[PDB]
Amino acid sequence: IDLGRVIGELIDHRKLIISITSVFTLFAILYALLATPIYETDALIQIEQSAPETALLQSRMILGKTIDDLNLQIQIEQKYFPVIGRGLARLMGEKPGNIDITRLYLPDSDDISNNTPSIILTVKDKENYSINSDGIQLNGVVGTLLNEKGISLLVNEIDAKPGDQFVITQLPRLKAISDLLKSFSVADLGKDTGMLTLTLTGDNPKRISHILDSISQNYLAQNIAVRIIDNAVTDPNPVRPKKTIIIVIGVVLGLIVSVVLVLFQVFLRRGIESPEQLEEIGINVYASIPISEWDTLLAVGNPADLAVEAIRGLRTSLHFAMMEAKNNVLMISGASPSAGMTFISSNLAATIAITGKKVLFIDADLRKGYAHKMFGHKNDKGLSEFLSGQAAAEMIIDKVEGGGFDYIGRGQIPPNPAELLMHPRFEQLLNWASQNYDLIIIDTPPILAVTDAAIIGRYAGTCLLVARFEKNTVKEIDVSMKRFEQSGVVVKGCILNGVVKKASS
Amino acid sequence: IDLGRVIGELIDHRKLIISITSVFTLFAILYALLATPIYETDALIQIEQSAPETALLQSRMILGKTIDDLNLQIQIEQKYFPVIGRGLARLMGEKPGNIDITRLYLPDSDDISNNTPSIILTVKDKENYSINSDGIQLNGVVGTLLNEKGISLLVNEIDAKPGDQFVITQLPRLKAISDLLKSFSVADLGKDTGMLTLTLTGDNPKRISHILDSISQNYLAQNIAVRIIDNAVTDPNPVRPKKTIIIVIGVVLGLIVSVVLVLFQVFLRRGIESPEQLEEIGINVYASIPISEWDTLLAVGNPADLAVEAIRGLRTSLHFAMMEAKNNVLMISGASPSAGMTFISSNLAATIAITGKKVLFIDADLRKGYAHKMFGHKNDKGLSEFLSGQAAAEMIIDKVEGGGFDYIGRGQIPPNPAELLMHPRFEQLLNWASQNYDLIIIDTPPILAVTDAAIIGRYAGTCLLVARFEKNTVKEIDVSMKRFEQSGVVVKGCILNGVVKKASS
Amino acid sequence: IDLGRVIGELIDHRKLIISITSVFTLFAILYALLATPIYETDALIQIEQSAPETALLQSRMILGKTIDDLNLQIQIEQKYFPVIGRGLARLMGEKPGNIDITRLYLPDSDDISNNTPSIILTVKDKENYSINSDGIQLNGVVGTLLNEKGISLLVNEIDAKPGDQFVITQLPRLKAISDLLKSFSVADLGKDTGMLTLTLTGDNPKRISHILDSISQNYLAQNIAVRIIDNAVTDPNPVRPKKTIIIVIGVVLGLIVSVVLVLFQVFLRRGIESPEQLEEIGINVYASIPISEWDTLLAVGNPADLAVEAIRGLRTSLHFAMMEAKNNVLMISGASPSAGMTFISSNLAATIAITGKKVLFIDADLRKGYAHKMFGHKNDKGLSEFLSGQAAAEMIIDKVEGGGFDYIGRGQIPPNPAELLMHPRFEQLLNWASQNYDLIIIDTPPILAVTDAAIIGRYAGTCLLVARFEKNTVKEIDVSMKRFEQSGVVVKGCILNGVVKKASS
Numbered sequence A, B, C: 001i002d003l004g005r006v007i008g009e010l011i012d013h014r015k016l017i018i019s020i021t022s023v024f025t026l027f028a029i030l031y032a033l034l035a036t037p038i039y040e041t042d043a044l045i046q047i048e049q050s051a052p053e054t055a056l057l058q059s060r061m062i063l064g065k066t067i068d069d070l071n072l073q074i075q076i077e078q079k080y081f082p083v084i085g086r087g088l089a090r091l092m093g094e095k096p097g098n099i100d101i102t103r104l105y106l107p108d109s110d111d112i113s114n115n116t117p118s119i120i121l122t123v124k125d126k127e128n129y130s131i132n133s134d135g136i137q138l139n140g141v142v143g144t145l146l147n148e149k150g151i152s153l154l155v156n157e158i159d160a161k162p163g164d165q166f167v168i169t170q171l172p173r174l175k176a177i178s179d180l181l182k183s184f185s186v187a188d189l190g191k192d193t194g195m196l197t198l199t200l201t202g203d204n205p206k207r208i209s210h211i212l213d214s215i216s217q218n219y220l221a222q223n224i225a226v227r228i229i230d231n232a233v234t235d236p237n238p239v240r241p242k243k244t245i246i247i248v249i250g251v252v253l254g255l256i257v258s259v260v261l262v263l264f265q266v267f268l269r270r271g272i273e274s275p276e277q278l279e280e281i282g283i284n285v286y287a288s289i290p291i292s293e294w295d296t297l298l299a300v301g302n303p304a305d306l307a308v309e310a311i312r313g314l315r316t317s318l319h320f321a322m323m324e325a326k327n328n329v330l331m332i333s334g335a336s337p338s339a340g341m342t343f344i345s346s347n348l349a350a351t352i353a354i355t356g357k358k359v360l361f362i363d364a365d366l367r368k369g370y371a372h373k374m375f376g377h378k379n380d381k382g383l384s385e386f387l388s389g390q391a392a393a394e395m396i397i398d399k400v401e402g403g404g405f406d407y408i409g410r411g412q413i414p415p416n417p418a419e420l421l422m423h424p425r426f427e428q429l430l431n432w433a434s435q436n437y438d439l440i441i442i443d444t445p446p447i448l449a450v451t452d453a454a455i456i457g458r459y460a461g462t463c464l465l466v467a468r469f470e471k472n473t474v475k476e477i478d479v480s481m482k483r484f485e486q487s488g489v490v491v492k493g494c495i496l497n498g499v500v501k502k503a504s505s
């Protein structure tokens, strides 16, 4: 391999790479702007050791005393239905509300799994609110305590706009202790000094400072039955999410997945890339027709098309190739269907007729031939009707309107096309036509599908295959040439079709 | 090797890979959803050392005192007959029952092996129950103690639905101590502090907490004749089984075993893959007939079949190959039986007869020939009867009904087929037929099995072998060609049969 | 590869390398001369340990006491609108001013983000000043305190020229402590001694010394409720930016990016470099025309041009190549447009006419031919009008004024150029002209674009291609030669055009 090839492949697939990288970067930006910020508060205490004090601070007694003091077993969560509602509310500048609950007691269903009872509180005004646990609706008022339906609740100082909802959960004490212990860290920072740094992370910058102050005070009171140097304060810059590293990771991930996909697609290509691939085997490529981005003939609708220019190049190439041929019959065929045989044949006939030579076009695709549709037709009396014997040699020839050449349609689809094409009346037709016309072009089905082309090619002076640019492979074209030679038909060469411009070439 | 080949092999064997991986993932999911959950309880004590205390806690004195206190020597197990009954009961939400037994004394058979006596208790109601040890049925009532048949039992507070069964075992004290010590761990967690973490795992989240509390209290009482900071609590999330890692391991195991099986099958393939394998040796492959997924002729029942199209391709190839041959006799043969010789020969005769040429078909498989069954027959007067001399040249020829060609059946199976085929009357028959027909096709047995084909091939102008797609190998076909040439028979080429579409090609 | 090639490439691209390196060095010099200088002050104290004292010095209590003492929470910044205004002011020798503020209290909006209120103070004279916070204009006087609009301010000892502006921010206490702690360092320097080195970096050489003295005094007073050996002094040489290393890094970065760009451009070149590239394939290069840096003929305006000398070399080469040719017709063509076909053909005709031979020039570029513009024209009756039949063979020939040869213009642009060129009247014209002139030169469109050149080349005795020096590639020229040979036209050789002098050759 070489650098030029890889750079060309990257240039060709630029749209895919850009789209994938942009999608990944957009997802990264959305996550980094919608993820909830996490603040960190710190405190510094002095040990008058410090190896067992790390375990004493994280023991369930200290944390449990803190949780009992601060009522951390009442989980209040602002209610947003979607997974991005909270982030959108924060971005729009909306101020989150809060409720001070000093007493909560749910009926404690305590089944096998749901060990955490929860209710939903809807704020109707600054004073009253509605409560629903499992569809049971109740009404409560700030101030006076509520003892109804096995539910006890005391709510103070609602701070939210009316219509807001809050999920109130009474999680078990061990769950609260585990959650507190997950986000709480103790370090020595000197490995020998009495200095201990206590760290607590959480999404509420004031609550975490209060929690760490309570932890420190409880530990201090417990020890004297240690010195608090730095009481806990919260860093106003969140520690998570780290937006810049997230976005950089997203961009690099997009680039690497795009490069992997591009390499995978490049290594899985088998189609023909250039005429030199065919010419390595020993197949003369007589032309390369580009894609015409422009039920009518292109050589007639848009005579100045680039594809028609390539076809004129093919015409002047054939005027020299088709010399010293046994007759004036040219047979266009191919390996696979929808390669361009009818396009090539019809347009070539048009470009050769505009130069003043009489041209006959025969649609010998007795199976899926649509030439009569493209030329303007009387569908009666096609090639089939002549071959089966129910027509004459003069009632099957029609004239293209915007063309300048005659044509013979397929006719009705027969049940035995390959056996009709073997009748000697076909050779009689070709011998008769080879005296009233200057050129005869025959369109045929593929050869890798059926055998009609190989029957027709016996009476053809020149035979050319059509290879589609990306679809067909060199193996298919070689197999087709060999199958034609096995049946006694000499293929003059190939015609690459549907070519497009690639920066890797 | 190259990446395209391996990707193609993976695409071809996709069904096998998917099935194996799905089976493994289903087994992993069943195990991860039916395995009994194992909870873990923890405690934290303070050592006022700690290297000998780990051995003192795990000594048999502390554990034995705990087991005597909590009666851990009475093993009560809920009875489910299958190995998945307990998991199903847990999944369906069924609440396990329990019995508080404060005194159990079994007769203690104490033979060589069964040192653990056991009984089965069936719950009939909230009060009474039935007991069976070795077929001896007894009835007991909660409350009043039972002393019968050398069995002492005191049962309190049955909690289960009627009809439940419980296995009650009186395991030896050392066995109970060993079981307790297997699931009990002590750690320092600081390597220098007085802090010891005690861990106990078990399937009953309350019993393990009680057991660890008893262990801690016994150690504390023993030492003062240490401080308990964190009394034991149980983590409600089970530590085993870890479902996600189990499922990931199952999926990866399925993928690796599937890839290994695929590679093993690929490396053990010897059959013909493409016509190019035969053409490397120098054997002209004249056709490749695909599998016809559609006692009748295919070229007649379904004339538009893909296989009949391939046979028409072979027909037009033969019309050119069979020129400049010494006569109009074609001999289809093969290497191994059930390769397609009769299929190819009969269908080829049909496709050549539909074009208006007189065709004779001869079934020279005098050993296992079934052509007369496929054509509609009068089984008398076949080839055998003519060769042995008990028939004429005109009483053996019959006509295929839906065909269009004549045929000669094998006749009765003779005892000496290879010696009948050497009679000059066979050559007389062929010389006579070569003047009344346009083509003669002869079907023969394989050549690697018997020698009839090599006797017949002396009088055949053209001879073609049939190679089955996956079954035969290049070695078999080369051996067959060489064995034909050794006997003076020139094989024109080969016919690949039963071809299917493979993404690795 | 070899050293000579790389040295030549470096010599050829010297201007690009010099420009890039100079730009990078200029940017580095601008940064190193405009970046604000950062001074460093040091102190040395003695510890009578020293592992916890590093944490005690950086604790928020000591730094907070210092900040409360020195009022470091009032941030005063000199106002320069651009990002280089301060550096320019320092370079021009301007003395920065300062204000001593002993009391500041802003309304403290304290919204979600802007936690730091700020005002702008404009100095009108040595006594009074103007204040604007959010468009609210106020006037204040040094001395008397200001308590207006929720803003309290006390300003003493303004030292600046009138018209200067100062941003006054009241940043939060924790922000001030964090900023102080970011630039403050403590080290032991012996790892065992009581000697501690305290370091403080800042842009004001006196303020940092005062700050470090206050830090040391506060720590000393705190400890005795330690010895100060070296009170803080400021190194007058700034520690940042380090100009020399910055400039060296800039120069080396410029050199490496220039070398990378040069290597990238060299590896992405595909055009023809020397005639030997064409002669490897087997194409005879008959000349190499250099660029003429000098609507007129070069061989006439500047007959002593270097390009005209190369064309005379081509003329004497052709006088030997064009012997034993079937006629006296020469056809200049090419692969891509704007290669030099009309330049080469017209100048060659001029140089061959100055030697006394009758020369005919034909502009057979019926699509974009501008020869009549370059020769002085009567645009009527060109080649088109003759071919279409509406003109005679004598009304189309005109005479070049400063030339010496006749010419035929294209005429009006036709709709069917390629089909006009196929008329036998073109061959009649050439046969008639081949008897009244000594040489006929025909200019043609490219061959990779259209097919006109291949139609004309049938009647041309000699055909030469023109390859542009850097534009065309060897692949294009080979494709053109092969496409000419496919149509029955033998190309004698090639002509390299637009050559320039490269030190890598």
Ligand SMILES: Nc1ncnc2c1ncn2[C@@H]1O[C@H](COP(=O)(O)OP(=O)(O)O)[C@@H](O)[C@H]1O
Residues within 6 Å of the ligand: A289, A290, A291, A292, A293, A307, A334, A336, A337, A338, A339, A340, A341, A342, A343, A344, A497, A498, A499
């Ligand atoms: N270079 C081309 N540019 C534009 N359209 C093309 C080109 N080649 C083929 N086609 C069009 O795509 C369709 C398939 O080609 P067609 O020749 O009709 O199939 P087949 O090769 O089986 O006879 C046709 O409608 C054709 O007009």
Ligand SMILES: Nc1ncnc2c1ncn2[C@@H]1O[C@H](COP(=O)(O)OP(=O)(O)O)[C@@H](O)[C@H]1O
Residues within 6 Å of the ligand: B289, B290, B291, B292, B293, B307, B334, B336, B337, B338, B339, B340, B341, B342, B343, B344, B497, B498, B499
């Ligand atoms: N390409 C094929 N498609 C469908 N059936 C086939 C094909 N080739 C052979 N068979 C069928 O499978 C059976 C075995 O083939 P057969 O020719 O009868 O055996 P043998 O080669 O020994 O004479 C037959 O019943 C045949 O009809």
Ligand SMILES: Nc1ncnc2c1ncn2[C@@H]1O[C@H](COP(=O)(O)OP(=O)(O)O)[C@@H](O)[C@H]1O
Residues within 6 Å of the ligand: C289, C290, C291, C292, C293, C307, C334, C336, C337, C338, C339, C340, C341, C342, C343, C344, C497, C498, C499
């Ligand atoms: N060696 C050259 N020196 C100076 N000018 C040149 C040279 N070669 C071509 N040109 C000029 O650059 C332009 C493009 O060349 P031209 O021959 O007219 O295009 P084309 O090859 O398509 O006919 C012209 O104006 C030509 O005069």
Ligand SMILES: [Mg+2]
Residues within 6 Å of the ligand: A341, A342, A365, A368, A369, A443, A444
């Ligand atoms: Mg078609």
Ligand SMILES: [Mg+2]
Residues within 6 Å of the ligand: B341, B342, B365, B368, B369, B443, B444
């Ligand atoms: Mg058989």
Ligand SMILES: [Mg+2]
Residues within 6 Å of the ligand: C341, C342, C365, C368, C369, C444
């Ligand atoms: Mg030009």
